[PDB]
Amino acid sequence: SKCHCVILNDGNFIPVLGFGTALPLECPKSKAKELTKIAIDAGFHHFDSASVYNTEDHVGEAIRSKIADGTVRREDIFYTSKVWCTSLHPELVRASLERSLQKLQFDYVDLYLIHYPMALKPGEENFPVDEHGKLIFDRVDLCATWEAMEKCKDAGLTKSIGVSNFNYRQLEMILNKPGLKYKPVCNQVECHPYLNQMKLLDFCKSKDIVLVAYGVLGWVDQNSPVLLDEPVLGSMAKKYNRTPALIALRYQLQRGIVVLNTSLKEERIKENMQVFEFQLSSEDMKVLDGLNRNMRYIPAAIFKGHPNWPFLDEY
Secondary structure, rough: OOHHHHHHHHOOOOEEEEEEOOOOOOOOHHHHHHHEEEEEEEEOOEEEEEEHHOOHHHHHHHHHHHHHHOOHHHHHHHEEEEEEEHHHHHHHHHHHHHHHHHHHHOOOOOEEEEOOOOOOOOOOOOEEEEEOOEOOEEOOOOHHHHHHHHHHHHHEEEEEEEEEOOOOOHHHHHHHHHHHOOOOOOOEEEEOEEEEHHHHHHHHHHHHEEEEOOOOOOHHHHHHHHHHHHHHHHHHHHOOOOHHHHHHHHHHHOOOOEEEEEOHHHHHHHHHHHHOOOOHHHHHHHHHOOOOOOOOOOOOHOOOOOOOOOOOOOO
16 A cells, blocks of 8 residues: 555545556557556556456456565555446446456456446447447436446445546536435546646546546647647756656646556656656646647547537536
8 A cells, every 4th residue: 555645535545646558459458468567567556447448357467466476465456447338237337347357356446437428239349330330329327327336336346436538517417416425536537738627627626536637648640740749848858857758747746636657668667657756846837737728639539429428518
């Protein structure tokens, strides 16, 4: 339990820097094993996975390996999973979490999220499509998923519950539910200097909810200027002799935001702990606040026509 940590509203602690375990589609899923071992040797305790990545076997094998040989204990690991759009029906939530625990060979996850606020046809295929390649959308009472999330916590299957990719109104719906037992501890969303999420952040904090960031570092499209090509991150990196990456990471930390980051490169994975080594100044923080340009690199476009698509409201 030794940590660079913030407390969540149910009294559990999460490491403020975590390792994402979704892979490039061109990687063998086994790559998440190797990367997890590397991230563990680098000093990472927080691992972020979901049913849908198809990486949870490999990550658990990585972690169990490093428990066996005594690098870490289970209690030193903060592990996150998420229920996928296809299992949001209340009966389907715990069944999917129990499956995940089978794949990991765990007793529990530390955190369990609703991945999106959008249901798809059950069950086995993660992207159920019809004749013309369009997702088959489903209906569910999210308040009922939540109740089901809530029972998973009571059963000891997960230590905390939260959500991901909710807008503030979808968050509201949960918080105003009659008979609510547990608030989401977090809302995990895309967050970076180009999409700094200040209004959602401000709303979460007002409701005792932690913001957890991903997409933290952001042919014509592919090769046009990128988030880390950003001139101000470039100069602040040199001004600090850190990387542009490490500026954007530290930006988030000084804002009380939990950061997830990933990389295929070990040297890259190790550099993340540098985020603990320096500090940005009040003025650099305010300059960095000025980069916000409503740039959403991860809009989930195939879901765009779903009634519950989170990315329409302002925040």
